[PDB]
Symmetry: C5
Subunit: 205 residues, 5 copies
């Protein structure tokens, strides 16, 4: 409506989507979780797993807040992600670019909270040779910021989700785990956090 | 015409295609139907169906109206979708990005009714293991707004179409049903609607 | 060309490539030719034919005309098509997006006659089951405006043209017929013309 | 550096990369050569050859000159090709879009001489049926302007050799020729020049 | 943050990403190294190797420097590579475009030192006919500037890395060397440096 129209004019004014929305040297906290939907394929030769998954990501951008009293009815807006700052999360062991399956929009509410929930297909490097054993194969999907350390971008995970995994796949899901690590590199004194999702699966029968 | 050109210059003036055209607390009603054109392939190993279908979407955008008496002769205009708000409808169970096959333009008439009618190829997760049986395989093509709840974007469904299904495919179309649902999610305050097209089909040569 | 450079500055000024250049209730006539160059492949399982063809499309855009006396020497110019209104021609039974193989330019002369001549590869739905028989397979390649009716866009066809068919294909091009129809739809008062190119072909072996 | 920065501000001023930089009725002479690097594959069923080649293209853009003593040290610059007018050269018998393998930058020196030297992968229509015979298969890769005739764009060849042909492929070169022609087409009163690279090759062994 | 935002406004104002940041008598030194992460596939028929690798590239762009006291808290910023000058490094023997697997961002600090660390998947021409043998197959991945000679772009290599190579690939990484070379072409007075990465590998047994 007219109030959203006006809201967009205001927020866009000096907004720079290339600048991480830190304030007073405090990190932007980014919440992150992966829901595995489908294992599409495994390449036992080239050691690759092909997966479809749902990412849940959220963080606050203080430059995107407003008073609902100034914009009655407007509690949250749908925004193209290209028009706002987004975490530069990399899939560490991807061997293909992500194919984003869903509209590239984020949800923003009046306290500046952003929710971005893409469904994604992507291939990853993985030792899939256990895929026929009862042990099964174990694949790690590792994500983290490519250019921001812990003190700029504080990546945290939220509860994992398996309810969405399709039941009719030829791969059975035996276990999925999530953990947050902080790793140090010779380059820098600050750590870089990453969230790793560990999937254990096997062929049915 | 010269009047159509004047009309673009006005309909552009304060229009933001990123903003859903709700008015006065009222949701935008979006009518939606799918017509199955062809089942291109089934992947029995990976559980995927590859379909070409024609979507009919229409809604009213009250910011896109004009008096015909001011712009005489202009009953309607064809507008690239990137110049107007369009519903962020997503295929919930798709495993590939949609490939839009037709010009990305929408028809808009003087009372702001918009019609966007793309043809699309896309692949969906589906249990196709029964494709070789008499009862066939059943696939749910489930669509809904990715970000807009019911009270902003009121998704309604209109009468389907089977008449466009190509007769020479190796897949016999045994039926297509469509239903609108609406649920609450634990995440959010407002309910969300979706329209699901259920397609049952089998290989003509299954025996 | 200095005069050419001035002509571009001037022509752009009030030009809107989204506006069909009808004038005085008259439809824009669009001449449409298709020259089949090569049948790349047939998929007998999925019922698809993969073709390379040359489209010739011309029409007059009255907003693109100029006085040659004002721009001496400038009789025709070569212009990116993205800067011009172009007919929204759809391939009705295509199952892939068109791959345009040639520079995306159109010729425009001083009376505003545009010629756009892309070479295109594209896959179409087709019953190719008879391809190995003596009768061969028949594929219809159907095109028409997606959003403009007859009184706005008058699609006219030109000579059938088989001369570009490569002679070393494994497919023998029996013949190519063509027809224009004005189809009515329940939705609308006005008909929408389409041109259909019917291609009959068979394996040389 | 600083002089180069100042040069850009001047050069960009009225520059239109959509406008062929002719002058005084005279064409823009464009030199062209092709050096074949590798035949990647042949498709005997669909009659296609997949090649990687090196184009050497050069021409004079008279709007891109400057006095070197006005910009001391600046004798040539690397410019993205999207900023420049470039010849609208097409591969007449390509069946795929060209895949440019190298940075899209052209060298431009102070008298307006432009060199653009892309390495390209591309598939062409070709009768490759004789590939396993002694005489081999002969493919013609034909290039020319898509929209400019002889009197606007004077395409000339320069000599090339086969030095860059990779020696460890499964194909050997039996013959290579490269020639410029000037033909009339049914459409136009003006001749259009082309350059054709004719390669004859066969499977080793 | 507010100071990062003011920093972007300031830099953008005069920055030109098309100008190489040389100064009179000083080339831009560019540091370069390749870490092989995985050999995805070898094509023994067409002579291609498909590899995933991490490039580390750095250089100083004096135009990107700022005074830290004018921008307290801001020691470094993440910048989209498309906003800055980047070395035009080409893969000499690549037969496909690079597929960049990581966010296209570089780290820039207050001295104007730019670090760009992309993960890349790319296919190269290589004689892999020895891959099943004892001595294995040897591939040269050759990189260097496509258009800048030594006195403009001083390409230099740094310490290599094998640590990242995946231990579960079917290919056993035997040896890896890197060398910086300087080559003259008949065309040009000035030499063009390249860094070449030599990989020896074999199928596991
Ligand atoms: C990019 N790198 C850190 C920075 C850094 O290393 C670095 C910084 C500056 C100079 C040299 C190296 C930032 C956080 C991500 C990390 C990624 C890891 O390297 C990596 C690279 C390639 C494959 C897997 C993992
Ligand atoms: C996106 N989601 C609702 C929003 C929401 O969940 C949500 C919102 C905010 C926070 C956390 C979750 C809105 C309506 C669509 C629905 C989609 C479905 O989840 C879904 C997820 C993954 C694959 C298929 C379908
Ligand atoms: C799009 N349609 C006409 C418009 C219209 O139908 C229509 C208009 C408004 C409302 C509902 C339907 C315009 C001319 C093209 C025609 C196309 C055909 O439907 C069609 C759709 C999908 C595959 C093949 C053919
Ligand atoms: C494009 N065409 C000429 C232009 C022209 O014909 C033309 C001009 C104006 C109107 C109608 C046709 C210019 C020079 C190249 C020539 C190309 C060849 O036809 C051709 C067509 C299809 C595939 C391969 C080659
Ligand atoms: C582009 N070329 C040099 C310049 C130059 O040759 C050249 C310059 C001017 C005119 C003619 C040729 C610059 C440094 C890179 C070198 C590339 C090599 O040729 C080459 C070409 C094709 C595949 C692999 C390698
Ligand atoms: C202004 C407003 O609606 N407040 C909410 C806050 O309570 C919530 O934590 C966040 C999403 O979790 O979005 C915001
Ligand atoms: C993630 C976030 O910022 N939200 C928190 C959440 O713990 C709480 O539930 C919400 C109120 O509903 O607001 C606050
Ligand atoms: C959204 C809308 O207004 N739908 C209209 C309907 O009310 C009307 O009865 C019909 C015929 O006039 O055309 C359509
Ligand atoms: C004002 C006008 O152009 N009339 C039509 C109207 O009859 C129809 O209800 C609506 C939806 O199709 O489109 C408009
Ligand atoms: C499409 C079109 O306008 N065709 C015209 C034709 O009517 C006319 O004879 C000539 C100019 O005299 O130009 C051509
Ligand atoms: C001034 C001029 O030559 N304009 C001609 C016009 O007469 C012709 O109708 C059109 C179509 O052929 O092409 C052009
Ligand atoms: C069009 C032109 O000027 N080119 C030639 C160029 O090949 C040659 O290298 C140089 C000799 O001075 O100038 C001349
Ligand atoms: C000022 C200058 O050096 N201009 C050169 C010219 O000598 C040469 O003919 C041409 C081809 O290299 O490049 C340009
Ligand atoms: C102010 C500052 O940190 N300057 C740094 C310098 O210390 C370092 O040698 C270089 C590479 O890291 O980047 C620059
Ligand atoms: C590349 C560069 O300029 N950096 C140098 C480097 O030799 C040194 O180790 C560093 C220490 O901070 O700063 C300085
Ligand atoms: O804004 C975004 C997009 C989202 C994509 C996740 C991803 C990126 C690259 C490779 C794999 C997955 C992360 N943040
Ligand atoms: O925003 C849009 C895109 C257009 C296409 C419909 C679609 C989207 C996603 C998956 C399948 C189909 C409708 N509205
Ligand atoms: O401006 C244009 C492009 C031309 C393309 C024809 C086409 C469209 C869609 C599918 C296949 C071919 C039509 N008008
Ligand atoms: O500016 C340019 C691009 C270069 C590409 C040549 C080409 C085009 C189309 C198919 C094959 C090769 C020519 N001039
Ligand atoms: O311009 C660039 C791109 C970036 C990546 C290097 C590269 C280019 C082409 C093929 C492989 C790798 C460095 N500089």
């Amino acid at each position: 409506g007219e109030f959203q129209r006006k809201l967009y004019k205001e927020l866009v004014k000096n907004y720079n989507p290339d600048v991480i929305p830190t304030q007073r040297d405090r990190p932007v906290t980014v919440y992150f979780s992966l829901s595995l939907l489908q294992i599409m394929d495994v390449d036992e030769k080239n050691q690759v797993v092909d997966v479809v998954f749902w990412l849940q990501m959220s963080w606050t951008d203080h430059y995107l807040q407003w008073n609902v009293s100034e914009y009655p009815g407007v509690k949250q807006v749908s925004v193209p992600i290209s028009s706002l700052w987004v975490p530069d999360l990399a899939a560490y062991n991807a061997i293909s670019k992500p194919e984003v399956l869903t509209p590239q929009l984020a949800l923003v509410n009046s306290s500046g909270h952003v929710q971005y929930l893409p469904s994604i297909r992507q291939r990853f490097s993985c030792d899939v040779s256990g895929v026929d054993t009862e042990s099964g194969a174990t694949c790690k999907l590792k994500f983290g910021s490519w250019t921001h350390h812990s003190r700029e971008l504080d990546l945290q995970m939220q509860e994992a989700d398996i309810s969405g995994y399709i039941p009719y796949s030829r791969f059975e899901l035996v276990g999925v785990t999530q953990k947050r690590s902080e790793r140090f590199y010779e380059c820098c004194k600050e750590p870089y956090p990453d969230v790793t999702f560990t999937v254990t699966f096997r062929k049915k029968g």
